[PDB]
Amino acid sequence: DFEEKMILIRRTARMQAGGRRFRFGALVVVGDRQGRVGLGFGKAPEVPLAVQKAGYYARRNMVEVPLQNGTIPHEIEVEFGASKIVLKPAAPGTGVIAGAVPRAILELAGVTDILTKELGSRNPINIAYATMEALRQLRTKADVERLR
RNA sequence: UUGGAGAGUUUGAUCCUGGCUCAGGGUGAACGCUGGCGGCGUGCCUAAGACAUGCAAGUCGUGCGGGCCGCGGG
Ligand SMILES: [Mg+2]
Ligand SMILES: [Mg+2]
Ligand SMILES: [Mg+2]
Ligand SMILES: [Mg+2]
Ligand SMILES: [Mg+2]
Ligand SMILES: [Mg+2]
Ligand SMILES: [Mg+2]
Ligand SMILES: [Mg+2]
Ligand SMILES: [Mg+2]
Ligand SMILES: [Mg+2]
Ligand SMILES: [Mg+2]
Ligand SMILES: [Mg+2]
Ligand SMILES: [Mg+2]
Ligand SMILES: [Mg+2]
Ligand SMILES: [Mg+2]
Ligand SMILES: [Mg+2]
Ligand SMILES: [Mg+2]
């Protein structure tokens, strides 16, 4: 099993004659607090199905984040559309310093020490993905040498 | 590398741009409601407007010559 957090749940709507009709959107991150996180956004005619379906995709999309004493190996900046995420290495005491969105991802990934900043569009969805694709580009001292 | 959190609000809904707004810290402060004690600070930011009264720069007889009161005594 995995540990799960609901980052976002939103109602959307579409028009047709006679009225508007809703659908729900569930941004869920899921992880083991020991180097494995997954982000999934799930939509359905009702709330919990969406939260379920979210969690489903969440697993069907993971990433192996190279923790290091609970911090990430290096500075990293990523832009997903107009959203930007900054990740910066932090020493033992620091805590996770971030907004909920990139927090929820970093805690459930087992980060315990990091400095972050959102820049640009701070739409949670895009920020979510931007933080994921960020982690996904983390490299270790090894990773680099093997590569080169 | 001791360091970096964001949120509300444009739409039926969306993403973006973009302003407004907020939570933080700060002060020679002021206003309200309330008000027990102590310590260290600290208190005319405006009229460099106008000020009653006291006080804030004096001292030396080991520079000099006198006055006035007294002490010692012809
Ligand atoms: Mg890896
Ligand atoms: Mg974006
Ligand atoms: Mg851009
Ligand atoms: Mg280091
Ligand atoms: Mg925002
Ligand atoms: Mg409005
Ligand atoms: Mg418009
Ligand atoms: Mg509205
Ligand atoms: Mg805004
Ligand atoms: Mg008062
Ligand atoms: Mg009173
Ligand atoms: Mg006093
Ligand atoms: Mg003055
Ligand atoms: Mg005048
Ligand atoms: Mg006058
Ligand atoms: Mg005096
Ligand atoms: Mg002399």
Swiss-Prot record:
Q: Which PROSITE patterns match?
A: RIBOSOMAL_S5, S5_DSRBD
BP GO terms, sorted: translation
Q: Any idea where the S5 DRBM domain is?
A: 2-65
Per the record, GO CC terms? small ribosomal subunit
What are the record keywords, sorted?
A: Ribonucleoprotein, Ribosomal protein, RNA-binding, rRNA-binding
Residue spans crossing the bilayer: none
As one GO molecular function, the record gives: structural constituent of ribosome
In terms of Gene3D superfamilies, this protein maps to:
3.30.160.20, 3.30.230.10
Subunit composition and interactions: Part of the 30S ribosomal subunit. Contacts proteins S4 and S8.
Its family remark reads:
Belongs to the universal ribosomal protein uS5 family.
Notes on the domains: The N-terminal domain interacts with the head of the 30S subunit; the C-terminal domain interacts with the body and contacts protein S4. The interaction surface between S4 and S5 is involved in control of translational fidelity.
Q: What is the purpose of this protein?
A: With S4 and S12 plays an important role in translational accuracy. Located at the back of the 30S subunit body where it stabilizes the conformation of the head with respect to the body. Binds mRNA in the 70S ribosome, positioning it for translation.
The miscellaneous remark of the record is: Is positioned such that it could physically interact with spectinomycin.
Name listed for the protein in its UniProt record: Small ribosomal subunit protein uS5
